[PDB]
Subunit: 112 residues, 2 copies
């Protein structure tokens, strides 16, 4: 349960090592029930031990992050998987080796 903005969210997500739950709250007058989601959010994170981490989106960051992450309305949770380097194939290798390594990484994606 941090608070993130457009300046701090990228690094929050990318180095969490967990699936991120971004909480879009909204104004208290328009969306007072968002507080109910806020109270349950840490219980939700806890219910999947080791898998999730939460952050609330700063009010000024809402428009841009909703657009980026595909959120239509508030309040919402956006569940986001950080980027991950599956592998690095360094130096010049033969065609068969490229195909085997790429294939193996795609297999891990498809059956982890």
């Amino acid at each position: 349960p941090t608070l993130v903005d457009e300046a701090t969210v990228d690094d929050f997500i990318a180095h969490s090592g967990k699936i991120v739950v971004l909480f879009f709250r909204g104004d208290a007058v328009r969306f007072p029930e968002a507080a109910d989601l806020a109270v349950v959010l840490p219980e939700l994170i806890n219910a999947f031990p080791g898998r999730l981490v939460a952050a609330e989106v700063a009010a000024e960051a809402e428009r841009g992050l909703m657009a980026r992450f595909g959120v239509a309305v508030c309040p919402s949770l956006a569940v986001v998987q950080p980027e991950r380097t599956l592998g690095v194939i360094a130096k010049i290798q033969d065609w068969s080796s490229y195909l085997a390594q790429i294939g193996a990484m795609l297999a891990e994606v498809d059956q982890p």
Copy 2:
């Protein structure tokens, strides 16, 4: 593969639903063999229909993107599962509904 830099890479790969292959080439004097990789790269992308998208890292972006993706050697291919939204849960829902929907997204991650 198109040239990307730190400012353009994320927009380039957005909404691909593919695995990204980022080519770090390097200076011709120190890494002449990078050109052999450049020639193989499009063939590699072609060898896995629908699975991959490729981009070449612009020279000025090499240092920053090597740090971002965990690359220590040139020439190389960094094979990256991009950041993506697994789902959005809109408006206030009940506890069992949150647990089922989150559980579903985690199940799809663990066994696509």
